[PDB]
Design an enzyme around this catalytic site. Structure first.
Site: not given
Ligand SMILES: Nc1ncnc2c1ncn2[C@@H]1O[C@H](COP(=O)(O)OP(=O)(O)OP(=O)(O)O)[C@@H](O)[C@H]1O
Ligand SMILES: Nc1ncnc2c1ncn2[C@@H]1O[C@H](COP(=O)(O)OP(=O)(O)OP(=O)(O)O)[C@@H](O)[C@H]1O
Ligand SMILES: Nc1ncnc2c1ncn2[C@@H]1O[C@H](COP(=O)(O)OP(=O)(O)O)[C@@H](O)[C@H]1O
Ligand SMILES: [Mg+2]
Ligand SMILES: [Mg+2]
Ligand SMILES: [Mg+2]
Lengths: 55, 472, 485, 120, 485, 128
Positions: E323-324, E349-351
């Site tokens: 998961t991101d 949150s990776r984004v």
């Protein structure tokens, strides 16, 4: 004079703290056993279940 | 012509039956064996192949000889349903065990039946007042909803229910079904006494509740089916009669416990912890049947056992999801002397919403939690340093908190023989105002002891005054 | 070569034996081999049968002869077992000649139904004050004795037996209470010396001993509790009262998990099989109070469980607690501080005590259990040294006096009549003024004051067993007057 | 040792060092045989084996055998099966501390730790 | 003969070893004589292992078996919108047949490496704590891990409700269709959930797939995969979709059940070896497509259930890796009054800001970093020592920012209402306000702008950014309100 | 090395490391379907190292006065000396030279924890 009274109380404060914190260690150290043994027995169960596989 | 067979194997509560005929009985069917003592009932579990089947004993398998003749019933274990079951003690098999003659019922439905359709599901948000402070204030139960009473051994799961039956079953108006699954045989008898004395069950007259027992003394097969037996009776009054019913189960855990004993002999690969692979399903089919439908409403109070006080255990952990209200008892609270040992933190409900219990009720409850929580988060500090090291603001919250905790306790009429104090029934209306008054800081002068095992808020000030004369 | 009542051994090992034959054998039926070793058909398969060995596998050879008994494993039951020490089979091991049994009962009996039962209401004086006050035991109750190594678990069960002598020597029967001690997984010397103490106190006359030493094969230790149970069930059905004590059930499960693991069974928590619950379950259920129609007989059980590091959260322990009608935990800490018996009121419990407790104690001891529960919470909270208010301090002074009053030496059982007075003073507070180091001498001196003076009160509480509104006043004026002097 | 107990009837002393490797030995044996491992990994038969050695060491009418066997505590933990089971037979314990021999006290027996079940 | 048919050899526990079927494919659907369908997972010479979608009390030895010839697929298209189907895609709401446009398989290959786009499109969750700290992006998979009874579902549910702001519109590229996947839940709950969606006119753009606990294990296992194909549909036709799995933790338990029963060796805790591959080939199916493909996208909000707060567990770690990012939810923060109890310390949150709204990006830059400093100062002021101006200043603001993030359930807030609040927080206009005031302040301030400074709200909404002029007016609008009252 | 020992000389052998050896042996044992013990190690794993270390010793004057020293290396996992393999080795050897990463960081190199490091022979084999 009121300084000599702080050190005296502070010397009592940290005396009981070491006794409670110290005795608290003799309590968690027991929980570290049952939890150590649990991990040794659990990891062993998967090993046995993977080998007891038949038809 | 009756279908007949011969035994090929007998291992514990698991007997393998073989049929010469090419017609085999389906799964979940019953079987009977002739014995000098009576008749032994079997239940099909799986078709091993070669016209051989695997079944689960309903009673002791002592004396069974290999190759003995076995008669088929032709249908899954059924039990009498209807008003005729009321005031009668039915066995797992579906036969009277109170020595009062056979239950002359009109119809007899099977214990196995499929769960209600999704379209048949009906939701409700009606509150149900019990009289219990720690409940009607924190996690109120809902009418025709699912109730759960988790807790280790000797925390207060039954005694908690007994009180619920002493306060709801009386002023209910509908029917009740009590089913003791894997429990002390003694508690069943004493339960029978209570129903008679209270008049809930009158031998000469009528009764308001049916008694189904599959006690722990009974083998695993029974401890596994008993829950289904009791449920079949209650789903009758639900659809057929369409009347409110109270379904009391204790203990529901025995259901999976009894099934994990045989899963091994059945030839299933043990999942982690030893529990059978199909824990989620079996437990699923049971809970899905115990619910309110568009035909009738049923309020179920299921008690769940917590092995080694572990809530992470797969058994209880898969039970929470099947409950609209959860009341967990921690032995760490009962040992403090606080009863019921309800844990306000862990306890949850679906009715804890301002759009139902009111805005004020929501706020008062929340404040109680925060206060109790802040006491817990500093617990580590207290044992090490003490309150002397606590800040002025923190030290005031502790005392107040400790006051709220003790106040949570409540004398139980059923447990009067333990506390020596007459029962105390408190209304929801007064309970809210009570805590709210304590939050406002209008009783910070009163000693904590005055909050211990106290009923009404008035009784607090009364008890506080009595302690003034006792001081010497 | 009759493959209907006899068969041949196919293989042997791990304490299990696979015999070929025995087509007319019953499930769990006793058997015998050419060597003379007794077994039991624990499971039946097509073409072979599983038999457990009650002796060493050395004596079982492959290819021997195997005859069946034709009857399930049973043990001699009757009054002739009194004063006699037997094993798991019921055979004498003391050497005083064969046992005089009236009959034979199955080793595996089913518990009485729900209808043929009644709530317990008959007090069972243990001799211990702290016990028969906080968590009393009644005829038909199942009181657990949980505690760590060397905490006084048997010390509470043992004194109970010696206190029964006060009624066993009487003429009346309903007053007498037979005793049946069960020793499993214990040492030879440990049991032998235990028996000797019984003879010194002349308590062996009304007591039966069943042996399952550790040296003996596991299964013996497994069947020992069940058989020993049937020995006492006899007294129950005859309208008599019996008392059986398991010491200890925790070892049994260990012995059973052995055969459980040997027979290849999926391990559970702590390597115990999932059916470990049904073990102690089926055993304890056979202890209750029958209805008047049955004979008004009962069977009180005192199971014993040994925990580790004061862990009541363990598996075996919790399983027992979910069956027994109350526990009497014995913390080690309190045991070292001198506080003996080291009964922890916090975890101690009695699910049917007041119902089977003397009303004389119910009156004088009110809310004493809950008070002590809250006592440790405030006591262990003020042990930091911080200053408290008058409310908490007042409860802290009275708690200490009660705690010391609960203390009692071993082999010193006290009559209920003698216990009632002591509790009364504690709750009222007359002891509070009394010095802490004088609480012990005070008890021995207070009892003599009543016998020498207000003896009438002692005789009234004895027979009546309840404190009237009048005797309550005569008692108060009698204690208050003594506290002053 | 039993020979001099039943024949010559003497108070023979049997020294075992160390009772711990005796349990370990069993654990390896029962391991190879295929028997399923009990809790903590020890053998299920552990309970019975221990007795097939401790019980044989007792005082008879002819003679007597006193056992003086060392003990090793696995990971300084007494909850462990091996130690737990061993102590169940022990009647006395003679501890030997370094701090005792450090004070020039010989033997290095520690008065505080040394306890006996016949001290009444 | 047996090429297209077969006879059942054994059956039980939802498993059926049928003999024959030597032309059936892998994972192919089949039908028994009883009417019940099944799925073939184990292909062997002797027999074929099949899993039942229904009860097994109907299948019996020697029964006929037929094949479908097709891989288990489900109906797809807009028609499903507002309907409630099961694993297979059949209606369970009782509102007519499912009018589907096409049918896609359960197992579909993840989108290519070439046909992808970096996530730039925001996903308004209406949750300030979320859209400000851990923003969601069209094409990513944001985990919602936490213990039971914390608020996992809540986060997801509110999101769907917030979408009403655009789904009622005319523009397509802006809307966002929602797919809830109930797995392991009871029918009672699902019914209440769907009731709540309707109470907010959110059922019209919502598809629900039910796999309650009562259903067969293979249904719960297949539920997510089929459900994903449903959503993938929009992704391919250049529309945006939002699927929520609740929860994969149960799905693995289900998939564990088929394995064990098919006699497939377990890995760790009985889970199948490829248990990772169970969630990997599921989550990867959701991503942002290339402009050539349609600019379509599928967002995923997987839900996991930890035990005792242990994220170090077997299944959870497996998913955290895919998961991101994750929205950790702690029970302890819930009681403290942090609702929703989002632990910023562990939620990421990776984004990142790429997905967040540009406007909201400005007002909160180091806000997450600041809340990190707050917990740093909050823990250090535990000592009970006085604090200087710096450590108390940040302590004052940090304590109020945490109070501003608290938002009530079922109350999604637009972007034009989040920016203003966060603005007044990060700057320091709330410092001079009492903590119990922040509550009503939010509502009052909003009502203030909607009445007077409404022009600004309209610019922030359309523009989505902050110009040199918009800041000026926004600055003055804030200070003017602080002065009021 | 025994060669040197038998012929009346001195040989030092360092096993670096026994930990890896056990893993290898475990692999063979499992693949051969032999009973798995604690941590997947067969019961004869201890018999392995004990039958290795006991090979090194100090031959008497009559045997040749030859000698074989052994320095076996064991890698613990986070200081866990309580593990299976380590417990076996530590039980057989005659002393340990415990090393801690922490002591290493401070600068103390080699980081030999004097507190734990011990030698049962001690002065018996140290220059006066
Ligand atoms: N009330 C008491 N006062 C003083 N000493 C006591 C008391 N109760 C027990 N003891 C002592 O404790 C010792 C330990 O024996 P006891 O049987 O009580 O322990 P136990 O926990 O029962 O051991 P086990 O469970 O192994 O039989 C006894 O020898 C006895 O002298
Ligand atoms: N934002 C919120 N503010 C206040 N209470 C909330 C909020 N969100 C959820 N709750 C409360 O928490 C309880 C459970 O919430 P939720 O359904 O989100 O938990 P969950 O993660 O779904 O647990 P489960 O998976 O067991 O359903 C509900 O009773 C609800 O009232
Ligand atoms: N409301 C209560 N007040 C005081 N004690 C209680 C209460 N409920 C349960 N208990 C305690 O529990 C004991 C009985 O245990 P029980 O409730 O039957 O446990 P379980 O849940 O295991 O059945 C009693 O001795 C009693 O002291
Ligand atoms: Mg109960
Ligand atoms: Mg004892
Ligand atoms: Mg949820």
């Amino acid at each position: 004079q009121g300084y000599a009274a702080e050190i005296s109380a502070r010397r009592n404060a940290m005396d009981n703290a070491s006794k409670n914190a110290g005795d608290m260690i003799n309590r968690y150290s027991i929980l570290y056993n049952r939890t150590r043994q649990a991990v040794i027995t659990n990891e062993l169960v998967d090993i046995i279940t993977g080998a007891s596989s038949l038809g | 012509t009756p279908i007949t067979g011969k035994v090929t194997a007998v291992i514990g509560a698991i007997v393998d039956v073989h049929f010469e005929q090419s017609e085999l009985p389906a799964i979940l069917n019953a079987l009977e064996i002739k014995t000098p003592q009576g008749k032994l009932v079997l239940e099909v579990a799986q078709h091993l192949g070669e016209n051989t089947v695997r079944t689960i004993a309903m009673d002791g398998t002592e004396g069974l000889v290999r190759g003995e003749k076995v008669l088929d019933t032709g249908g899954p274990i059924s039990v009498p349903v209807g008003r005729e079951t009321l005031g009668r003690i039915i066995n797992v098999i579906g036969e009277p065990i109170d020595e009062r003659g056979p239950i002359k019922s009109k119809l007899r439905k099977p214990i196995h039946a499929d769960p209600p359709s999704f379209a048949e599901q009906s939701t409700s948000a009606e509150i149900l007042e019990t009289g219990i402070k720690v409940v009607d204030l924190l996690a109120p139960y809902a009418r025709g909803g699912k109730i759960g009473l988790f807790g280790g051994a000797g925390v207060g799961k039954t005694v908690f229910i007994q009180e619920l039956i002493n306060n709801i079953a009386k002023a209910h108006g509908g029917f009740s079904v009590f089913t003791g699954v894997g429990e002390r045989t003694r508690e069943g008898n004493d339960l029978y006494r209570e129903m008679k004395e209270t008049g809930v069950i009158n031998l000469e007259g009528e009764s308001k509740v049916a008694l189904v027992f599959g006690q722990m003394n009974e083998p695993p097969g029974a401890r596994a089916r008993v829950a289904l037996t009791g449920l079949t009776i209650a789903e009758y009054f639900r659809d057929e009669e369409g009347q409110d019913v109270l379904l009391f189960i204790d203990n529901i855990f025995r259901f999976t416990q009894a099934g994990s004993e045989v899963s091994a002999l059945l030839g299933r690969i043990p999942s982690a912890v030893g529990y059978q692979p199909t824990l989620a399903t079996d437990m699923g089919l049971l809970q899905e049947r115990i619910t309110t439908t568009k035909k009738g409403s049923v309020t179920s109070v299921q008690a769940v056992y917590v092995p080694a006080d572990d809530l992470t255990d797969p058994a209880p952990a898969t039970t929470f999801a099947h409950l609209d209200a959860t009341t967990v008892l921690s032995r760490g609270i009962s040992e403090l002397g606080i009863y019921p040992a309800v844990d306000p933190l862990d306890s949850k409900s679906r009715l804890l919403d301002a759009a139902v219990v009111g805005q004020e009720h929501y706020d008062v409850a929340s404040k109680v939690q925060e206060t109790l929580q802040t006491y817990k988060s500093l617990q580590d500090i207290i044992a090490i340093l003490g309150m002397d090291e606590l800040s002025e603001q923190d030290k005031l919250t502790v005392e107040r908190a400790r006051k709220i905790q003790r106040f949570l306790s409540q004398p139980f009429a059923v447990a009067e023989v333990f506390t020596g104090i007459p029962g105390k029934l408190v209304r929801l209306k007064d309970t809210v105002a009570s805590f709210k008054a304590v939050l406002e800081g209008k009783y910070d002068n009163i000693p904590e002891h005055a909050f211990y095992m106290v009923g009404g808020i008035e009784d607090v000030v009364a008890k506080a005054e009595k302690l003034a004369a006792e001081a010497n | 070569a009759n493959l209907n009542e006899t068969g041949r051994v196919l293989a042997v090992g791990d304490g299990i034996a696979r015999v070929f034959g025995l087509n007319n054998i019953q499930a769990e039926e006793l058997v015998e081999f050419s060597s003379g070793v007794k077994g039991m058909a624990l499971n039946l398969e097509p073409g072979q049968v599983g038999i457990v060995l009650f002796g060493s596998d050395r004596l079982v050879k492959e290819g021997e002869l195997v005859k069946r008994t034709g009857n399930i494993v049973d043990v001699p039951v009757g009054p002739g077992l009194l004063g006699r020490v037997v094993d798991a089979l019921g055979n004498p091991i003391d050497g005083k000649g064969p046992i005089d049994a009236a009959g034979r009962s199955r080793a595996q009996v089913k518990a009485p139904g729900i209808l043929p039962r009644r709530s317990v209401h008959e007090p069972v004086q243990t001799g211990l004050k702290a016990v028969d006050a906080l968590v009393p035991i009644g005829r038909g109750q199942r009181e657990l004795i949980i505690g760590d190594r060397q905490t006084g678990k048997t010390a509470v069960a043992l004194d109970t037996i010696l206190n029964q002598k006060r009624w066993n020597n009487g003429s009346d029967e309903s007053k007498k209470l037979y005793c049946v001690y069960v020793a499993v997984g214990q040492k030879r010397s440990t049991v032998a010396q235990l028996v000797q103490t019984l003879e010194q106190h002349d308590a062996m006359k009304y007591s039966i001993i069943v042996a399952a030493t550790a040296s003996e094969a596991a299964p013996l230790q497994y069947l020992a509790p069940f058989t020993a149970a049937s020995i006492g069930e006899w007294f129950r059905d005859n309208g008599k009262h019996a008392l059986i004590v398991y010491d200890d059930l925790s070892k049994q499960a260990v012995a059973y998990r052995q055969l459980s693991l040997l027979l290849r069974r999926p391990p559970g928590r702590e390597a115990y099989p999932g059916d470990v619950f049904y073990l102690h379950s089926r055993l304890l259920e056979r202890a209750a109070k029958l209805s008047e129609k049955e004979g008004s007989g009962s069977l009180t059980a005192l199971p014993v469980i040994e925990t580790q590091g004061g862990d009541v959260s363990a598996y075996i322990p919790t399983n027992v607690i979910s069956i027994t009608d109350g526990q009497i935990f014995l913390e080690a800490e309190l045991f070292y501080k001198g506080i003996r018996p080291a009964i922890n009121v916090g975890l101690s419990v009695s699910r049917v005590g007041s119902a089977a407790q003397v009303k004389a104690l119910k009156q004088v001891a009110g809310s004493l259990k809950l008070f002590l529960a809250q006592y440790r919470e405030v006591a262990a909270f003020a042990q930091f040294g911080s200053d408290l208010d008058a409310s908490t301090k007042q409860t802290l002074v009275r708690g200490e006096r009660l705690t010391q009053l609960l203390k009692q030496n071993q082999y010193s059982p006290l009559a209920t009549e003698e216990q009632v007075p002591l509790i009364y003073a504690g709750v009222n507070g007359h002891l509070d003024g009394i010095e802490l180091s004088r609480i012990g001498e005070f008890e021995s001196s207070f009892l003599s004051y009543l016998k020498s003076n207000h003896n009438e009160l002692l005789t009234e509480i004895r027979e009546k067993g309840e404190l009237s509104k009048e005797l309550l006043a005569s008692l108060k004026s009698a204690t208050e007057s003594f506290v002053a002097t």
